[PDB]
Amino acid sequence: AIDEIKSRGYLLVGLSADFPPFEFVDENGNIVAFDVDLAKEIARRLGVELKIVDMTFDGLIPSLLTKKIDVIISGMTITEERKKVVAFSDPYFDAGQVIVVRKDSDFRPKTYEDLVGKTVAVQIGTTGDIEVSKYDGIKVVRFDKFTDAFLELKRGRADAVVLDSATARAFVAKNPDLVISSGVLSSEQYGIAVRKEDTDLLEFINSVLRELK
Ligand SMILES: NC(=[NH2+])NCCC[C@H](N)C(=O)O
């Protein structure tokens, strides 16, 4: 809780920095982008310093539950399944899943059904993984890091990547060989995850988000 954060002198924020425009590693090795700046605002308003801890996305809730981080600010969708294990702030971004393919491939899937019979790369433990995993006949290939999922697609070892719309746009801008084939397939909102007992921290973060909006 806040007493504990004040006592070490800094907020510990967990994320996976493979997710522009929310968090990524720049060419100097620094972790930057929207969530980083959100983290900084929260810390400044709390009156403490900030430490970002980059890890695998699917390790973030494990890290939060074991108190190795205070909060997750990592483009994380608020889900009923996750609301069983953690608390979320008010939402701060709307997105949904899309399908990315190679422009040179002779296919342009529009729906999850269109990926039946195809090999689809996802980042493990994302809402994208969760969705494609429900469809029998999609062969899912799962990666800790989105960079590796895109390398799989570029190299032709997968047919498609499924991931959130804003990040899909960022990866396709970097990779003119790739294209978003589908419209948006889900209605998701991002929130900041806090341990359920840390009601003080949740409240404070909600107040910061409200002032920002
Ligand atoms: N920093 C990241 N890699 N974030 C992945 C988030 C994907 C999706 N919004 C989810 O919550 O599962």
Instruction: Answer yes or no: are the C-beta atoms of 95 and 79 closer than 8 Å.
Output: no
Biggest CA–CA distance in the chain, Å, is 58
What is the domain partition of the chain in residue ranges?
Answer: 1-95+186-213, 96-185
Token duo for residue 156: 């032709």
Decide if 75 contacts 21 (C-beta within 8 A): no
- At position 69, the amino acid (one-letter code) is I
CA of 94 to the centre of ligand 1 (A): 12
Distance CA 57, CA 40 (A): 20
- Residues near 3 by Cβ (< 8 Å), separated by ≥ 6? none
| CB of 155 closer than 8 Å to CB of 137 | no
From the centroid of its chain, how far is CA 24? 11
Buried/exposed code over 185-206 (b: 16+ C-beta within 10 A; e: otherwise): bbebbbbbbbbeebeebbebbb
Q: How many CB atoms lie within 10 A of CB 19?
A: 26
Pocket of ligand 1 (CB under 6 A): 15-16, 18-19, 23, 57, 74-77, 123, 126-127, 146, 164, 188
22 close to 167: Cβ distance less than 8 angstroms: yes
Angle at CA of residue 173, ends 171 and 177, nearest 5°: 85
Integer angstrom CA distances of residue 9 from 37, 51, 194: 19, 10, 18
Resolution (A): 1.6
CA 190, CA 110: separation in Å to the nearest integer? 24
Q: Whose CA is nearest to atom 4 of ligand 1?
A: 75
- Tell me the sheet residues that pair with 122: 142
Q: By what technique were these coordinates determined?
A: X-ray
Asked if residues 194 and 77 have their Cβ atoms less than 8 Å apart, the reply is no
Specify the ligand 1 atom closest to the Cα of 77. Answer: 11
Residue 142 phi/psi, 5° resolution?
-115, 140
CB 16 within 8 A of CB 124: no
Within a 10 A sphere around the Cβ of 150, how many other Cβ atoms? 22
3-state secondary structure of 41: helix
Q: Are 11 and 42 in contact (CB under 8 A)?
A: yes
The DSSP result for 44-111, as a single string, is: HHHTSEEEEEE--GGGHHHHHHTTSSSEE-SSPBP-HHHHTT-EE-S--EEE-EEEEEETTSS----S
Nearest to 13 by CA among 81, 64, 47, 86: 64
Neighbours of 65 (CB within 10 A): 14
Of 152, 166, 164, nearest to 118 (Cα)?
152
The residue to mutate among 76, 79, 165, 184, having the most atoms of ligand 1 within 8 angstroms of its beta carbon, is: 76
Span from the CA of 128 to the centroid of ligand 1 (angstroms) = 8
Integer Cα distance of 56 and 73 in angstroms:
13
Cα–Cα distance, 115 to 64 (Å, whole number): 34
Helix 34-46 vs helix 199-212: crossing angle, to nearest 10: 110
Contact (Cβ atoms closer than 8 angstroms) between residue 116 and residue 138: yes
